[PDB]
Write an enzyme that holds these catalytic residues in place. Structure first.
Site, PDB file in Angstrom:
ATOM      1  N   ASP A   1      10.081  16.440   7.545  1.00  0.00           N
ATOM      2  CA  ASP A   1       9.475  16.031   6.281  1.00  0.00           C
ATOM      3  C   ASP A   1       7.948  15.978   6.477  1.00  0.00           C
ATOM      4  O   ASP A   1       7.318  14.927   6.571  1.00  0.00           O
ATOM      5  CB  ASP A   1      10.066  14.694   5.810  1.00  0.00           C
ATOM      6  CG  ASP A   1       9.765  14.373   4.344  1.00  0.00           C
ATOM      7  OD1 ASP A   1       9.529  15.303   3.528  1.00  0.00           O
ATOM      8  OD2 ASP A   1       9.818  13.172   4.000  1.00  0.00           O
TER       9      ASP A   1
ATOM     10  N   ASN B   1       2.551  12.159   4.450  1.00  0.00           N
ATOM     11  CA  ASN B   1       2.912  11.661   5.774  1.00  0.00           C
ATOM     12  C   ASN B   1       1.838  11.885   6.823  1.00  0.00           C
ATOM     13  O   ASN B   1       2.053  11.553   7.989  1.00  0.00           O
ATOM     14  CB  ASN B   1       4.233  12.279   6.240  1.00  0.00           C
ATOM     15  CG  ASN B   1       5.438  11.744   5.470  1.00  0.00           C
ATOM     16  OD1 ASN B   1       5.331  10.791   4.674  1.00  0.00           O
ATOM     17  ND2 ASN B   1       6.595  12.367   5.688  1.00  0.00           N
TER      18      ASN B   1
ATOM     19  N   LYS C   1       4.687  16.326   4.898  1.00  0.00           N
ATOM     20  CA  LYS C   1       3.971  16.384   3.629  1.00  0.00           C
ATOM     21  C   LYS C   1       2.596  15.751   3.812  1.00  0.00           C
ATOM     22  O   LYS C   1       2.386  14.984   4.759  1.00  0.00           O
ATOM     23  CB  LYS C   1       4.736  15.686   2.483  1.00  0.00           C
ATOM     24  CG  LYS C   1       5.617  14.469   2.858  1.00  0.00           C
ATOM     25  CD  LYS C   1       6.303  13.770   1.660  1.00  0.00           C
ATOM     26  CE  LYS C   1       7.104  12.556   2.169  1.00  0.00           C
ATOM     27  NZ  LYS C   1       8.282  12.012   1.398  1.00  0.00           N
TER      28      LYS C   1
ATOM     29  N   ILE D   1       0.803  -1.214   0.000  1.00  0.00           N
ATOM     30  CA  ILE D   1       0.000   0.000   0.000  1.00  0.00           C
ATOM     31  C   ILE D   1       0.833   1.259   0.000  1.00  0.00           C
ATOM     32  O   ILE D   1       0.265   2.365   0.021  1.00  0.00           O
ATOM     33  CB  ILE D   1      -0.979   0.020   1.178  1.00  0.00           C
ATOM     34  CG1 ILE D   1      -0.219   0.024   2.485  1.00  0.00           C
ATOM     35  CG2 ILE D   1      -1.813  -1.203   1.135  1.00  0.00           C
ATOM     36  CD1 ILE D   1      -1.130   0.155   3.700  1.00  0.00           C
ATOM     37  N   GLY D   2       2.147   1.144  -0.102  1.00  0.00           N
ATOM     38  CA  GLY D   2       2.976   2.322  -0.203  1.00  0.00           C
ATOM     39  C   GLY D   2       4.407   1.913  -0.418  1.00  0.00           C
ATOM     40  O   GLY D   2       4.905   1.027   0.279  1.00  0.00           O
TER      41      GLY D   2
HETATM   42  C1  LIG Z   1      13.508   7.446   4.259  1.00  0.00           C
HETATM   43  N1  LIG Z   1      12.177   6.884   4.038  1.00  0.00           N
HETATM   44  C2  LIG Z   1      11.927   5.614   3.331  1.00  0.00           C
HETATM   45  O1  LIG Z   1      12.821   4.970   2.875  1.00  0.00           O
HETATM   46  C3  LIG Z   1      10.468   5.131   3.154  1.00  0.00           C
HETATM   47  C4  LIG Z   1      10.148   3.794   2.940  1.00  0.00           C
HETATM   48  C5  LIG Z   1       8.812   3.413   2.782  1.00  0.00           C
HETATM   49  F1  LIG Z   1       8.478   2.111   2.585  1.00  0.00           F
HETATM   50  C6  LIG Z   1       7.793   4.343   2.818  1.00  0.00           C
HETATM   51  C7  LIG Z   1       8.109   5.665   3.029  1.00  0.00           C
HETATM   52  C8  LIG Z   1       6.998   6.699   3.078  1.00  0.00           C
HETATM   53  N2  LIG Z   1       5.824   6.114   3.692  1.00  0.00           N
HETATM   54  C9  LIG Z   1       4.727   5.863   2.963  1.00  0.00           C
HETATM   55  C10 LIG Z   1       3.584   5.311   3.549  1.00  0.00           C
HETATM   56  C11 LIG Z   1       3.604   5.010   4.956  1.00  0.00           C
HETATM   57  C12 LIG Z   1       2.481   4.448   5.654  1.00  0.00           C
HETATM   58  C13 LIG Z   1       2.547   4.193   7.035  1.00  0.00           C
HETATM   59  C14 LIG Z   1       1.424   3.550   7.852  1.00  0.00           C
HETATM   60  C15 LIG Z   1       1.515   3.273   9.220  1.00  0.00           C
HETATM   61  N3  LIG Z   1       0.411   2.679   9.610  1.00  0.00           N
HETATM   62  N4  LIG Z   1      -0.409   2.514   8.590  1.00  0.00           N
HETATM   63  C16 LIG Z   1       0.151   2.998   7.515  1.00  0.00           C
HETATM   64  C17 LIG Z   1      -0.547   2.948   6.164  1.00  0.00           C
HETATM   65  F2  LIG Z   1      -1.673   2.186   6.286  1.00  0.00           F
HETATM   66  F3  LIG Z   1      -0.923   4.215   5.850  1.00  0.00           F
HETATM   67  F4  LIG Z   1       0.291   2.398   5.216  1.00  0.00           F
HETATM   68  C18 LIG Z   1       3.737   4.464   7.715  1.00  0.00           C
HETATM   69  C19 LIG Z   1       4.837   5.007   7.042  1.00  0.00           C
HETATM   70  C20 LIG Z   1       4.758   5.286   5.646  1.00  0.00           C
HETATM   71  C21 LIG Z   1       5.874   5.853   4.976  1.00  0.00           C
HETATM   72  O2  LIG Z   1       7.044   6.122   5.668  1.00  0.00           O
HETATM   73  C22 LIG Z   1       9.427   6.059   3.195  1.00  0.00           C
END
Ligand SMILES: CNC(=O)c1cc(F)cc(Cn2ccc3cc(-c4cn[nH]c4C(F)(F)F)ccc3c2=O)c1
Length: 378
Positions: free
Chosen positions: A184, A189, A186, A68-69
């Protein structure tokens, strides 16, 4: 036996096992086994360590439903615990990639904050574990989506932005008073919970302040549409900023919610970077904006130099800005009032607010040493 009992203390069992397991990992290579000592060790321990690795939390105990991300050094999976059927979001950081392309220390703060803040405003981590390729952060899953997806699917009304901005402000302030700057901020986030309330995430970029309340960094961090001009300027050495750089990004977020474009957009990075530095001359609202008086005001008060930036003195002088006048909440209870968008959730694994997605060494390297102590079980 005392320090051993503390899951924060550097020498608890989770750590001691990580080292022992990291030792076997970094030593069992046919080349290195040509040393007698190393073979003697791997002999006495390889059978047991493999049995141990099986009994420790491992990636296989998690049913993986969807990615999902994604991100720079890994992805976030929606997972369900096989044995307990509980639902989590699981971030994966690649040890391979962090070693090569990173400071490869950003993850300690990211874990520690999500494991210990116990704030309504911070995504809660329940487990941190690892294996030979990856770091794993297991956190409560936020099924509302991010504020990006939401702005993507609604004409956001200033009433709503008045709501979301306030929640981000309280959350950034919560993060702040724990000693940390979230470099960061955004809409990617900012995540929404079961009832549609804000939680901050991706603390990969957090830095603890000193006692004077500043940080001294010498590399520009964040993502470009949102980098504050001091952090952007800090790339050139002698970076001295305080927490006010988050309020700059809060500014960019209000602009993007109301206008629909980021205030210092440019086709190139160098363009955006330049447009940020020239913010007195580059910030303008589109003539066809339909932006409020107080709204345009608050946003301009954020998107200025740090010396005069609103929120320099504290959070209390952001709360009292007229933009926040409303017949729907007060500042001390806003998480207790109803959210402007409450997610219609059918199941515990509803993924609808989400769109779809080493070398073998000659000699000893110790590639697994940076990760000793990361394992943690709440
Ligand atoms: C230096 N940064 C990196 O290398 C990096 C690596 C990644 F895999 C992702 C990211 C950016 N990102 C994107 C979605 C995301 C989603 C959740 C989260 C937590 N609880 N539930 C969810 C949800 F359901 F929304 F997914 C927590 C953290 C992130 C998150 O950090 C950054």
């Amino acid at each position: 036996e005392a320090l051993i009992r503390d899951p924060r203390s550097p020498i608890n069992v989770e750590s001691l096992l990580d080292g022992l397991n990291s030792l076997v990992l970094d030593l069992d290579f046919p080349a290195l086994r040509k040393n007698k000592n190393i073979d003697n060790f791997l002999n006495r321990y390889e059978k047991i360590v493999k049995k141990i690795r099986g009994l420790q939390m491992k990636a296989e105990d998690y049913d993986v439903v969807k990615v999902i991300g994604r991100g720079a050094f890994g992805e976030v999976q929606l997972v369900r615990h096989k044995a307990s059927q509980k639902v989590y979001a699981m971030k994966l950081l690649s040890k391979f990639e962090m070693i090569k392309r990173s400071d490869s220390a950003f993850f300690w703060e990211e874990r520690d904050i999500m494991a210990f803040a116990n704030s309504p405003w911070v995504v809660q981590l329940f487990y941190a574990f690892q294996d030979d390729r990856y770091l794993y952060m297991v956190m409560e899953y936020m099924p509302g989506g991010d504020l990006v997806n939401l702005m993507s699917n609604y004409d956001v009304p200033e009433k709503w932005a008045k709501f979301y901005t306030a929640e981000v402000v309280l959350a950034l302030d919560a993060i702040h008073s724990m000693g940390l700057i979230h470099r960061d901020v955004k809409p990617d986030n900012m995540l929404l919970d079961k009832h549609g309330h804000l939680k901050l995430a991706d603390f990969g970029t957090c830095m603890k302040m000193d006692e004077t309340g500043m940080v001294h960094c010498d590399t520009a961090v964040g993502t470009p549409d949102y980098i504050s001009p001091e952090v952007l300027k800090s790339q050139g050495g002698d970076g001295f900023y305080g927490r006010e750089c988050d309020w700059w990004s809060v500014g960019v977020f209000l602009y993007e919610m109301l206008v629909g474009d980021t205030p210092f957009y440019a086709d190139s990075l160098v363009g955006t970077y330049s447009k940020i530095m020239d913010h007195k001359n580059s910030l303008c609202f589109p003539e066809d904006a339909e932006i409020s008086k107080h709204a345009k005001n608050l946003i301009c008060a954020f998107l200025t130099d740090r010396e005069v930036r609103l929120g320099r003195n504290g959070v209390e002088e952001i709360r009292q800005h007229p933009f926040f006048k409303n017949d729907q909440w007060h500042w001390d209870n806003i998480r207790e009032t109803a959210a402007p968008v409450v997610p219609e959730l059918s199941s515990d694994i509803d993924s609808s607010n989400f769109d779809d997605i080493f070398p073998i060494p000659k000699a000893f390297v110790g590639n697994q040493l940076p990760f000793i102590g990361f394992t943690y079980y709440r």
